[PDB]
Enzyme design. Structure first.
Site, mmCIF file in Angstrom:
data_model
loop_
_atom_site.group_PDB
_atom_site.id
_atom_site.type_symbol
_atom_site.label_atom_id
_atom_site.label_comp_id
_atom_site.label_asym_id
_atom_site.label_seq_id
_atom_site.Cartn_x
_atom_site.Cartn_y
_atom_site.Cartn_z
ATOM 1 N N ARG B 81 0.858 -1.184 0.000
ATOM 2 C CA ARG B 81 0.000 0.000 0.000
ATOM 3 C C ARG B 81 0.894 1.234 0.000
ATOM 4 O O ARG B 81 0.684 2.173 -0.751
ATOM 5 C CB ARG B 81 -0.896 0.054 1.230
ATOM 6 C CG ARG B 81 -2.378 0.163 0.911
ATOM 7 C CD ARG B 81 -2.806 1.572 0.588
ATOM 8 N NE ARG B 81 -2.601 2.502 1.713
ATOM 9 C CZ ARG B 81 -3.331 3.605 1.917
ATOM 10 N NH1 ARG B 81 -4.354 3.956 1.114
ATOM 11 N NH2 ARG B 81 -2.995 4.387 2.949
ATOM 12 N N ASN B 113 -8.048 8.461 -9.680
ATOM 13 C CA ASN B 113 -8.795 7.876 -8.553
ATOM 14 C C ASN B 113 -7.821 7.691 -7.416
ATOM 15 O O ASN B 113 -6.819 6.975 -7.585
ATOM 16 C CB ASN B 113 -9.401 6.580 -9.024
ATOM 17 C CG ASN B 113 -10.280 5.959 -7.958
ATOM 18 O OD1 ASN B 113 -10.993 6.651 -7.234
ATOM 19 N ND2 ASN B 113 -10.228 4.621 -7.879
ATOM 20 N N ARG B 144 -24.969 10.018 -13.465
ATOM 21 C CA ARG B 144 -25.538 8.731 -13.160
ATOM 22 C C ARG B 144 -26.813 8.879 -12.342
ATOM 23 O O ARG B 144 -27.730 8.063 -12.465
ATOM 24 C CB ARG B 144 -24.582 7.857 -12.351
ATOM 25 C CG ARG B 144 -23.271 7.615 -13.101
ATOM 26 C CD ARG B 144 -22.446 6.523 -12.461
ATOM 27 N NE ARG B 144 -21.448 5.932 -13.343
ATOM 28 C CZ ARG B 144 -20.291 5.416 -12.952
ATOM 29 N NH1 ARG B 144 -19.944 5.485 -11.706
ATOM 30 N NH2 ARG B 144 -19.471 4.860 -13.822
ATOM 31 N N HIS B 168 -15.594 11.908 -4.722
ATOM 32 C CA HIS B 168 -15.883 10.921 -5.757
ATOM 33 C C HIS B 168 -15.177 9.614 -5.425
ATOM 34 O O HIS B 168 -14.002 9.667 -5.005
ATOM 35 C CB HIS B 168 -15.390 11.383 -7.119
ATOM 36 C CG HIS B 168 -15.352 10.309 -8.168
ATOM 37 N ND1 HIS B 168 -16.498 9.807 -8.729
ATOM 38 C CD2 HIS B 168 -14.306 9.660 -8.726
ATOM 39 C CE1 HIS B 168 -16.204 8.877 -9.615
ATOM 40 N NE2 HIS B 168 -14.868 8.772 -9.629
HETATM 41 N N1 LIG Z 1 -13.331 9.685 -12.170
HETATM 42 C C1 LIG Z 1 -13.953 8.533 -12.470
HETATM 43 O O1 LIG Z 1 -15.119 8.202 -12.232
HETATM 44 C C2 LIG Z 1 -13.131 7.470 -13.288
HETATM 45 C C3 LIG Z 1 -13.820 6.571 -14.117
HETATM 46 C C4 LIG Z 1 -12.942 5.691 -14.812
HETATM 47 C C5 LIG Z 1 -11.590 5.739 -14.698
HETATM 48 N N2 LIG Z 1 -11.066 6.696 -13.883
HETATM 49 C C6 LIG Z 1 -9.547 6.796 -13.660
HETATM 50 O O2 LIG Z 1 -8.888 7.213 -14.834
HETATM 51 C C7 LIG Z 1 -7.512 6.579 -14.872
HETATM 52 C C8 LIG Z 1 -7.344 5.978 -16.164
HETATM 53 O O3 LIG Z 1 -7.923 4.681 -16.320
HETATM 54 P P1 LIG Z 1 -7.854 3.906 -17.735
HETATM 55 O O4 LIG Z 1 -8.796 2.810 -17.713
HETATM 56 O O5 LIG Z 1 -7.778 4.957 -18.765
HETATM 57 O O6 LIG Z 1 -6.389 3.211 -17.585
HETATM 58 P P2 LIG Z 1 -5.394 2.436 -18.475
HETATM 59 O O7 LIG Z 1 -4.659 1.455 -17.556
HETATM 60 O O8 LIG Z 1 -6.040 1.748 -19.658
HETATM 61 O O9 LIG Z 1 -4.458 3.603 -18.909
HETATM 62 C C9 LIG Z 1 -3.533 4.504 -18.268
HETATM 63 C C10 LIG Z 1 -2.567 4.961 -19.358
HETATM 64 O O10 LIG Z 1 -1.618 5.865 -18.716
HETATM 65 C C11 LIG Z 1 -0.340 5.590 -19.254
HETATM 66 N N3 LIG Z 1 0.675 5.983 -18.312
HETATM 67 C C12 LIG Z 1 1.070 5.384 -17.143
HETATM 68 N N4 LIG Z 1 2.023 6.007 -16.475
HETATM 69 C C13 LIG Z 1 2.317 7.100 -17.210
HETATM 70 C C14 LIG Z 1 3.281 8.163 -16.948
HETATM 71 N N5 LIG Z 1 4.096 8.215 -15.910
HETATM 72 N N6 LIG Z 1 3.255 9.119 -17.946
HETATM 73 C C15 LIG Z 1 2.470 9.132 -19.022
HETATM 74 N N7 LIG Z 1 1.564 8.122 -19.289
HETATM 75 C C16 LIG Z 1 1.506 7.124 -18.358
HETATM 76 C C17 LIG Z 1 -0.271 4.093 -19.594
HETATM 77 O O11 LIG Z 1 0.737 3.761 -20.467
HETATM 78 C C18 LIG Z 1 -1.703 3.854 -20.000
HETATM 79 O O12 LIG Z 1 -1.827 3.736 -21.456
HETATM 80 C C19 LIG Z 1 -7.460 5.780 -13.530
HETATM 81 O O13 LIG Z 1 -7.112 6.778 -12.589
HETATM 82 C C20 LIG Z 1 -8.938 5.371 -13.296
HETATM 83 O O14 LIG Z 1 -9.289 5.048 -11.989
HETATM 84 C C21 LIG Z 1 -11.784 7.599 -13.121
#
Ligand SMILES: NC(=O)c1ccc[n+]([C@@H]2O[C@H](COP(=O)([O-])OP(=O)(O)OC[C@H]3O[C@@H](n4cnc5c(N)ncnc54)[C@H](O)[C@@H]3O)[C@@H](O)[C@H]2O)c1
Ligand SMILES: NC(=O)c1ccc[n+]([C@@H]2O[C@H](COP(=O)([O-])OP(=O)(O)OC[C@H]3O[C@@H](n4cnc5c(N)ncnc54)[C@H](O)[C@@H]3O)[C@@H](O)[C@H]2O)c1
Ligand SMILES: NC(=O)c1ccc[n+]([C@@H]2O[C@H](COP(=O)([O-])OP(=O)(O)OC[C@H]3O[C@@H](n4cnc5c(N)ncnc54)[C@H](O)[C@@H]3O)[C@@H](O)[C@H]2O)c1
Ligand SMILES: NC(=O)c1ccc[n+]([C@@H]2O[C@H](COP(=O)([O-])OP(=O)(O)OC[C@H]3O[C@@H](n4cnc5c(N)ncnc54)[C@H](O)[C@@H]3O)[C@@H](O)[C@H]2O)c1
Lengths: 297, 297, 297, 294
Positions: B81, B113, B144, B168
């Site tokens: 963690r 998140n 939603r 959130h």
């Molecule tokens: N606010 C909300 O309700 C909500 C809803 C869905 C997802 N999210 C959040 O959005 C984020 C994205 O999720 P996703 O499904 O798009 O993820 P994903 O795993 O498909 O993608 C993340 C991308 O970031 C890139 N990445 C990682 N480290 C990096 C760095 N240091 N520099 C530049 N690029 C980098 C990766 O290569 C990857 O392609 C997470 O934080 C997820 O929890 C929030």
């Protein structure tokens, strides 16, 4: 009102849906997928976007009868793991049931096929549904031509939309660039560059994308949306799509005129002998593979 | 011209990109991602779509200096963690420093998140004034609630007013005293509809998406896009986003007036005492989690 | 597909057609105008625009049979006094009869003056269900109130809630008890802003437009377009339109739920006693003016 | 952000503004018109539309300083009443002051000229502002090509967008259809119908429109908007516009590659001898009337 049905909500089908919903193209959408939890997940996620979208759209899932008054039905089913043509055992296994439900729903609009191998699956769909061949078409080399325009565009630092010409034949195998039809900045590209380099970048460009992320989605999704808008608007737009020409007797890509009833007219290209030669090679390939599989359905 | 930078081209990031490109919202796009193959595959795939798209967009990848004149930048990044916290704060520090050093001076929209914590961390690391650093927050949660209420009353979600406030991802809540449907406060119609059930359906909604897709994208991507347009158009639009209010001292979702400079003004909701109580509980949680992660920098 | 008919291609009708065509909202358009040369000039002018437009649209002129499957039809038609009433009622009957005889069975949106009286007259002559015949009513006056309050608080007019009720053109009033700005009911902010001045500002603008151009077009054209989209998308959107409520028994502007079948449901505002009084006063005037003109049929 | 300025809010001006605002193309708009009450009226009319539009746009009127950071500025000033080459006297008067004000605002984007006679007014605008010739272009025969595509499309029952080729020369006078560049359904049009009938429809088509309602607007307004979009998006799109090619040394319509910095390159068409001849003829009329005026 406009109604679009999407069969197979995977990487491509979901990109088609997002491209349409983002611009507010249709009023009603029907999502159909064998995997129930997946399609219901996409329905809800899109319905959660609606409060923040500019245009409204209604979405229903796995309801064949809802296709009865659809303008366009887009087939994007398949198994991308088989690409990561070998997909033929999979997609050909699906056309009998999908085709029969489609026919039975009362649907009478235009069917646009994306499922690979696109030329052969377009033909089997026409064969199972019994729809007139001008109502059943495939994206075919509309994607291949867009890769060619991108490649020629990068070389001359031009808008790809400013490059004219087509890629003909069998998508994902013997399709070729008809360099006699390509023109850039007022001149035919052959009287101007390493054309084979450009053709390689065009032809290998699709493996680069699959190789990089595991699938391809924006390129082909946008090609399907362009054809779906030409149908609903009855534009009579010339597009290179997989269509069954009388002289060919089998589906293969060649420019045609598209409107609300599908293929309204064929075009005529003055291809070099070389290019005609390649075109019938593609015809023969498609024809044989189709021949082997049509009895199996 | 309009220039948008997207950091992190994953599930959410590519959906944000496709949402903007399908509509032709921006002229120039900058995609930044640690995986060169994936971002390069997406760029080529979008460039393949250009020949068949209505509007043109230019796409550059992994060029931090290209962000200098970007209007908006959307970031989708977000024992063991402790390790996880250490690595997340490190990533925000690296991305934030390079972002600051590029000369970018627009508005930064964060999707992540926990979004409120990560937004406050980007504000901390970059040194950008807090009004230019905002997170999507409960804009998705509100949408939603709008979907659930809309379905309950066979109404357009856009016609449902009211918001979800707070944290959130955990302690956010529907401020039911702000929700109106068909001219009447929904609390009144409740006293005569079961509001707890409605709250269940909206939350349950997100789980169905996660269970069937393994992630959510269209709902949240659309949120960022709505915010991005308010910024470029200098709309002065009221949107519920994660922002830092003077009275709260921490970042949390609450309606604010968005424009080209980011948060231009705060709104004042007359919440009930229980609602006011939950708001502060939420604020205390975000404070705790922020202190905790900022200590691993 | 989407088909829209427009009756009366004058300043307002042509602004409605251009707004729809610039966004590619419909596939087919039917223009009907008494002046053959004016409607023919516009048709050719819009067909000259199609080669440089992103979306395609088909335009046919003065063909009533073409309205049969139209989704929506927008009517922009509108001693001496008796003579004028007589010619006006005659015109509504001729148009109404030809419209009814065409087979059209969509939603009729009426832009006129007095819009409530002419809307009720068209309902009367066509025999169409009242829920399928609506007027723009005070949707344009609401938008002006939103502009004036928005300029007052330096906000996005879309962020100003509330409505203008009643009779478009004379006795309509701002239902101030429904207007909210930045989370607060504007009346309380007034107890602390001069609503009277705001109400006057809104009105003055309309007069500023009439005096500088001689007519208003974009403001009211956009109102019709928004209603038309809610109808084709079957949005179930809450919009303030001229509709006939059972409790009023005569047309007037009061919010209602709009969908593909027209008015799907009514809303219930909690107006104050002065508001209810002015609403009933408004209704008595519409009823009386309607009585007078229906007598000349 | 995107910022567009419109000079002259008449029939064409307000049509350009409505086409952009309906689509939500730009973020900020600057409306400039000598008749202040007409510009102030359209401003408020569009602001009244804003609560029922999907996208937001900001509008300021008669503020030349606000043009400092405009991406594109479209000139649609003139007097259509004189058209019912007539406006040349009037429109030439305006170019000095409008050009000077424009030059002094700090504006440094692309200037798109609609004002007739479009080729000569484009040349005077370039000439008075001192802006590089590639940053000052006119709609030219983009509108005329669109009429040719309409006529040909109507004759073959095709989408006008599927008809290729151009109309070159001087708009509203010596402009002609380079029939060697036109092709439909994979074949050269001159290999397939009476082209003179089609030619006439296309050539007289602006009179019909003008005689039917007193002015023309959607056709030319949409041509201006297509250019403006290629500029802001830096598309490098091939468009036929009024540009000053080196081999001609005078503004005339010929396809060029358009981007954010204006004309980025010239195209070269394999015109027939006759076609070549007509184009030079056009150049002389433009050259001559231009010298004649200043
Ligand atoms: N606010 C909300 O309700 C909500 C809803 C869905 C997802 N999210 C959040 O959005 C984020 C994205 O999720 P996703 O499904 O798009 O993820 P994903 O795993 O498909 O993608 C993340 C991308 O970031 C890139 N990445 C990682 N480290 C990096 C760095 N240091 N520099 C530049 N690029 C980098 C990766 O290569 C990857 O392609 C997470 O934080 C997820 O929890 C929030
Ligand atoms: N023609 C082209 O230019 C082109 C380009 C890219 C991909 N493709 C083809 O597109 C198809 C889909 O691509 P993808 O990446 O989205 O694949 P994918 O594997 O991600 O998605 C396929 C979707 O189809 C659904 N499906 C399968 N059988 C079905 C059936 N009988 N009924 C309804 N739904 C069914 C699956 O459940 C899955 O959700 C493949 O055939 C791929 O080859 C064609
Ligand atoms: N509700 C509002 O706020 C509002 C706002 C602005 C205008 N309007 C109304 O809109 C109407 C039109 O205004 P406008 O400026 O467009 O008018 P206009 O004079 O410019 O044009 C009216 C058009 O209708 C055509 N026409 C007349 N009689 C016809 C018939 N019998 N059949 C078919 N076509 C016919 C004419 O040829 C003309 O082209 C009037 O009622 C005006 O008051 C209402
Ligand atoms: N190039 C083409 O293909 C083409 C096609 C159609 C129309 N046009 C031209 O477009 C121009 C405008 O046409 P229209 O029908 O809109 O005419 P119009 O008379 O209705 O509008 C011209 C506008 O220019 C304004 N104006 C005049 N001088 C001005 C100055 N010094 N500063 C600011 N504003 C000024 C007027 O007040 C007016 O509102 C005319 O020259 C017409 O010939 C060109």
């Amino acid at each position: 009102a406009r109604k679009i049905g999407i069969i197979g909500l995977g990487n491509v089908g979901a990109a088609v849906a997002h491209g349409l919903i983002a611009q507010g193209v249709a009023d009603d959408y029907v999502f159909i997928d064998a995997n129930e939890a997946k399609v219901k997940a996409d329905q809800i996620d899109f319905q959660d976007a609606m409060a923040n979208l500019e245009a409204h759209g209604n979405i229903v899932i796995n309801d064949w009868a809802a296709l009865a008054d659809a303008d366009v039905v887009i087939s994007t089913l398949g198994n991308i793991k088989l690409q990561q043509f070998a997909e033929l055992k999979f997609t050909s296994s699906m056309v009998q049931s999908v085709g029969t439900n489609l026919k039975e729903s009362g649907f009478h609009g235009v069917l646009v096929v994306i499922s690979n191998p696109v030329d052969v699956i377009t033909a089997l769909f026409q064969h199972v549904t019994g729809f007139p061949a001008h109502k059943v078409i495939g994206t075919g080399t509309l994607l291949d031509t867009a890769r060619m325009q991108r490649a020629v565009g990068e070389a001359f630092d031009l808008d790809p939309r400013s490059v004219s010409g087509y890629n003909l034949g069998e998508h994902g195998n013997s399709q070729f660039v008809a360099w006699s039809t390509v023109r850039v900045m007022g001149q035919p590209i052959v009287t101007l560059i390493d054309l084979a380099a450009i053709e390689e970048e065009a032809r290998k460009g699709g493996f680069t994308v699959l190789n990089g992320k595991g699938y391809t989605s924006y390129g082909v999704a946008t090609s399907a949306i362009r054809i779906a808008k030409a149908v609903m608007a009855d534009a009579h737009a010339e597009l290179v799509v997989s269509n069954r020409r009388d002289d060919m007797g089998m589906y293969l890509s060649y420019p045609a005129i598209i409107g609300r009833d599908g293929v309204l007219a064929e075009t005529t290209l003055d291809l070099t002998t070389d290019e005609q030669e390649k075109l019938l090679q593609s015809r023969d390939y498609i024809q044989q593979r189709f021949d082997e599989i049509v009895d199996t359905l």
